[PDB]
């Protein structure tokens, strides 16, 4: 059960909190609050100024020990085990690297734990991140009403700042609603109704594209859309044609009514079972009319198959923050990785020093910094299963050679991680040949160590590295617990030489992959390359969010961000086998075809400029096309409407492997936003695609309207035959009419 986001009373009531700063050393006794929808955390501090934090930007909430302390004495005096038991700390930012910390002292006892625990829940909530277009507009509204001056009112310079895409055309929108339009004034929350924020947006941003869609449905009489027209549109256009009528039945008439009762401005149509244009426009951005089903975003993958069958989210040199040769090494990344749904992190361990005797993590004695192991193991023990109850694979690149330091390393693991650390094999899965690798379910909340084996080798079991010889030799020995790591170009050589032998390897054994050494700015290879051959532990640089990593954390969102996506049927079955370069469709694998026409976009930028949109597909080589583009739009970023031919993807061989990538770009090449949609689960019809930033957080205002047609493949030649299977009664009846007519002529 996926609950919707619900703020508990305490967090609207409020609670007294003291904001304090590491650097400039400050203090305001503020009362924290969250609005009822749970969009924003907000507090009123510096001389009555309301300051807001966007909850969809929140990355972690920490209390107690994990809540960072103020190490300065002057701040520590002003504030005071009890004292830290009411410390809160809010981590946020647009990606793992560039985070921002905010600290709080709860004045009354134990409310910080209540507060920390509830902010986490609201931030991670899946229903929220995939909220409806209409809800994301309520977000923008709720922002304005929060951010106020000292005397409560809503400054008009905000309303112009928010939609600063045609300021002289904004001016005229406001006046028509009976509101203030001059920059120097303000507006009473009394009379900035949501009803009126809606009417404002309509006059400002006109929708020629939707006027098109209504007559395009069919209504010469433009004022009204009747109950059946809606129901026929919803069933014969918004419904995905690859779905069963028993499992996913069509919308009934009594059901279709409720959507009119729900989304209605005008009562003249409501009473007589019709619908307005603004009721239809309301439906398009509606909670029902989403691009994907919750089924997809939910955690409803089969999680009892062996470990070797799942794509696993994986990091490379997790500690690094940007460059490979020079720069920081951070403990922060190990949290920001595991918090992001990663399940494989790399720890490069090196021998200590004579004065002390503690191992440290760093990069191959180049010119990067160090970090203490002890802390990193506890950074991981905190965040391991904070966003996913499924196991973590610690990738030890061990260079420590001293049985004194090697034994502390095994003791640290056993004490810090505790019982989570998988110390010995289970009852069901003994370490012998012929035994399958245990399922993710069977290892809920376990830390799996990956180190070389023959004190640290005592901890190693199901993930054990071996010097890869060939797939032949790896089938000869036949052991799932043995696995191999492959450098980029070494894994690349296997791909052109023995790609079929590879898919078979990955059906039983794990295979890790990482980027090559020439990528010294931590550049990322395309992980689809190796995913195609069933590679599980495809490791990437989380410090860099290029098109590769934008994809990675995009596809892994699905299955409740557990970090485990299930490989296709035929890449898991032993009895089955196919080729990843098949330029033609496969038997047993129902292929798909796709259409993607870009209609329009809303509130795309904070300035006038042309925009264009890229529609690309990522899967098997033959599936992959990535050069389709719109023409840079007229030159206004309010409500551009592209007048273009649908981008065609007619032959998608394996559709469970294909992911679509809609991404918006400003004239010049700057990124606006993107979205990763899986081709197997996408819907057909007119749908908004609320956009996201590179780290996959939901950008609020910008959104695109796109028309999708996701149907099954039929080779052109065999179309006739297909259509007779779907409706045979009509096919046979037609032949009977012919035989009937020629009856009299033959005798």
């Amino acid at each position: 059960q996926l609950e919707p986001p619900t703020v508990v009373e305490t967090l609207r009531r409020g609670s007294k909190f003291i904001k304090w700063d590491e650097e400039t050393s400050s203090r305001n006794l503020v009362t924290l609050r969250v609005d009822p929808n749970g969009f924003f955390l907000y507090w009123t501090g510096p001389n009555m100024e309301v300051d807001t934090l966007d909850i969809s930007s929140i990355r972690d909430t920490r209390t107690g020990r994990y809540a960072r302390l103020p190490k300065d004495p002057k701040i520590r005096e002003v504030l005071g085990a009890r004292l830290e038991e009411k410390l809160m700390t809010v981590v946020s930012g647009p990606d793992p690297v560039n985070t921002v910390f905010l600290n709080f002292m709860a004045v009354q006892d134990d409310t910080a734990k209540v507060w920390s625990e509830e902010l986490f829940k609201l931030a991670m909530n899946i229903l929220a991140q995939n909220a409806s277009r209409n809800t994301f507009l309520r977000k923008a509204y709720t922002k304005l009403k929060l951010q106020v001056n000292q005397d409560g009112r809503i400054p008009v310079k905000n309303i112009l700042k928010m939609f600063s895409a045609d300021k002289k055309r904004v001016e005229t929108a406001l006046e028509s609603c009976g509101l203030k339009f001059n920059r120097s004034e303000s507006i009473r929350p009394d009379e900035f109704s949501l009803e009126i924020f809606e009417r404002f947006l309509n006059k400002l941003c006109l929708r020629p594209d939707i006027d098109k869609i209504l007559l395009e449905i069919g209504a010469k009489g433009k004022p009204y859309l009747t109950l059946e027209q809606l129901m026929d549109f919803i069933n014969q256009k918004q419904r995905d044609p690859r779905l069963n009528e028993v499992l996913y039945p069509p919308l009934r008439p009594s059901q279709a009514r409720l959507l009119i009762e729900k989304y209605e401005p005008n009562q003249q149509f409501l009473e007589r079972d019709q619908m307005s244009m603004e009721g239809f426009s309301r439906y398009l951005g509606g909670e029902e009319n989403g691009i994907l089903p919750l089924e997809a975003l939910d955690l409803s993958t089969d999680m009892t198959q062996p470990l070797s069958a799942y794509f696993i989210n994986s990091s490379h040199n997790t500690y690094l923050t940007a460059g490979q040769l020079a720069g920081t090494s951070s403990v922060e990344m190990y949290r920001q990785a595991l918090l992001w749904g990663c399940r494989c992190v790399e720890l490069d361990v090196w021998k200590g020093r004579p004065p002390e005797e503690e191992p440290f993590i760093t990069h191959g004695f180049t010119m990067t910094t160090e970090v203490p192991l002890r802390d990193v193991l506890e950074a991981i023990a905190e965040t391991a299963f904070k966003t996913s109850p499924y196991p973590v694979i610690l990738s030890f690149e061990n260079h420590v050679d001293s049985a004194k330091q090697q034994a502390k390393m095994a003791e640290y693991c056993r004490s810090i991680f505790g019982d989570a650390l998988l110390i010995e094999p289970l009852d069901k899965y003994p370490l012998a040949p012929g035994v399958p690798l245990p399922s993710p379910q069977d290892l809920m909340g376990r830390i799996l160590v990956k180190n070389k084996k023959r004190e640290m080798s005592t901890l190693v079991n199901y993930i054990e590295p071996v010097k890869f010889k060939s797939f032949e030799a790896a089938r000869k020995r036949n052991k799932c617990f043995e696995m191999s790591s492959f450098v980029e170009t070494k894994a690349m050589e296997q791909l052109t030489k023995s790609p079929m032998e590879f898919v078979e390897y990955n059906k039983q054994q794990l295979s890790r992959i990482y980027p090559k050494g020439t990528r010294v700015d931590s550049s990322n290879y395309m992980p689809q390359l190796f995913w195609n051959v069933g590679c599980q532990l495809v490791a990437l640089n989380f410090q860099t969010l290029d098109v590769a990593m934008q994809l990675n954390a995009g596809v892994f969102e699905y299955n409740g961000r557990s970090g485990y996506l299930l490989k296709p049927e035929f890449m898991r079955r032993p009895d089955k086998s196919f080729d990843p370069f098949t330029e033609v469709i496969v038997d047993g694998i129902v292929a798909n075809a796709l259409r993607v026409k870009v209609i329009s976009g809303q509130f795309l930028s904070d300035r006038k400029v042309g925009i264009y949109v890229e529609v690309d597909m990522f899967g098997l080589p033959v599936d992959t096309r990535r050069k389709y583009r719109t023409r840079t739009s007229q030159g206004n970023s309010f409500n551009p409407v592209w007048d273009e031919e649908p981008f065609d993807f007619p032959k998608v061989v394996l559709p469970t492997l294909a992911s679509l990538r809609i991404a918006a770009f400003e004239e010049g090449g700057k990124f606006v936003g993107h979205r990763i949609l899986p081709v197997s689960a996408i819907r057909s019809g007119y749908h908004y695609v609320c956009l996201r930033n590179e780290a996959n957080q939901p950008l609020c205002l910008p959104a695109l309207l796109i028309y999708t047609e996701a149907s099954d493949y039929i080779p052109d030649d065999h179309q006739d035959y297909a259509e007779a299977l779907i409706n045979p009664i009509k096919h046979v009846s037609l032949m009977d009419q012919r035989a009937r007519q020629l009856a009299a002529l033959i005798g």
């Binding site: 059960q1 044609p241 690859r242 779905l243 069963n244 009528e245 028993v246 499992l247 009895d575 089955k576 469709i585 496969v586 038997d587 047993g588 694998i589 129902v590 292929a591 099954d712 493949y713 039929i714 080779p715 065999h718 035959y721 297909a722 007779a724 299977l725 779907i726 409706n727 045979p728 009664i729 096919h731 046979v732 009846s733």
Partner: protein, 317 residues
């Protein structure tokens, strides 16, 4: 030298394909341990809830009063259930469904199941509630044979008989589903069409005006004349013959297929008329067709009927 022959199971919706695949699993395949049975206990519960919700809605549509009034409440309790969320089966829902199943009113609605949509083996479960309601009910193997789980996709099953390995391809029988069927039309040694003998007096789920047997018929007649199967054998299982045995007593074949003028209330006469509609007078198919009257829930009937068909196929190879 271990030969592998590919068999398609085809048919209209709910003709019995996936019920056959289970029989194959019991006869030749791995069969059902207790842990396998337990997997369906959920699915049994969901079938009973789906049954009575669909019967309740009919009471409204067909305008049939509940004999006893205290059962008006019970109907409301159950109708508000989300059936996908059913995991256990406890009071008040148990007695709600019993008290309803006893209601002379809703028993009238069960007799008119023909007019709406109510899956088969509804009566098998509801007459045996007390066994199923029990706090330790392990499903019996027939309970697993009766269970109804709509099938979507194209699922290939292998089977190790002594001489040969059959790869039996299960599919969906709804209208939408046949657009996928082309992705299993290669290297096909034989087809196994399933017709549900009971559906002569019934209309499709996916089309309210059209008669299920006109579909199953036309589909079969078309499909055997396709280029892919120019060298493939065509076994025709007429399934659900036990249901006919009961239904033909009251639902008269003459009223839905006017060409029939054999005796009324005769099981044997009725089934052999159907057989002719499928095979006889087909100009585009002059290959032999091997029919068979079957009952996929009845295991012995299937071991006999298939351990024949095994021969008929191998013999042509």
């Amino acid at each position: 030298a271990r030969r592998e022959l590919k068999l398609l199971l085809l048919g209209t919706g709910e003709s019995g394909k996936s019920t056959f695949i289970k029989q194959m699993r019991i006869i030749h395949g791995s069969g059902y341990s207790d842990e396998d049975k337990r997997g369906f206990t959920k699915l049994v519960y969901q079938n009973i809830f789906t049954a009575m919700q669909a019967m309740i809605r009919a009471m409204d549509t067909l305008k049939i009063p509940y004999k006893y009034e205290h059962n008006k409440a019970h109907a409301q309790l159950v109708r508000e259930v989300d059936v996908e969320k059913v995991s256990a089966f406890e009071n008040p829902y148990v007695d709600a469904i019993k008290s309803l199943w006893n209601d002379p009113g809703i028993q009238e609605c069960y007799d008119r199941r023909r007019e709406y949509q109510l899956s088969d083996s509804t009566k098998y479960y509801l007459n045996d509630l007390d066994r199923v309601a029990d706090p330790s009910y392990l499903p019996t193997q027939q309970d697993v044979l009766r269970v109804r789980v709509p099938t979507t996709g194209i699922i290939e099953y292998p089977f190790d008989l002594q001489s040969v390995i059959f790869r039996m391809v299960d599919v969906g029988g709804q209208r939408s589903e046949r657009r996928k069927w082309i992705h299993c039309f290669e290297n096909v040694t034989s087809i196994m069409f399933l017709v549900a003998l009971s559906e002569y007096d019934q209309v499709l789920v996916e089309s309210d005006n059209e008669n299920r047997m006109e579909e199953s018929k036309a589909l079969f007649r078309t499909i055997i004349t396709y280029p892919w199967f120019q060298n493939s054998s065509v076994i025709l299982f007429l399934n659900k013959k036990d249901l006919l045995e009961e239904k033909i007593m009251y639902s008269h074949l003459v009223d839905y297929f006017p060409e029939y003028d054999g005796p009324q209330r005769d099981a044997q006469a009725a089934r052999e008329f159907i057989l002719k509609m499928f095979v006889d007078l087909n100009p585009d198919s002059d290959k032999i067709i091997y029919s068979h009257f079957t009952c996929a829930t009845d295991t012995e009937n299937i071991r006999f009927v298939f351990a024949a068909v095994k021969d008929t196929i191998l013999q042509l190879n």
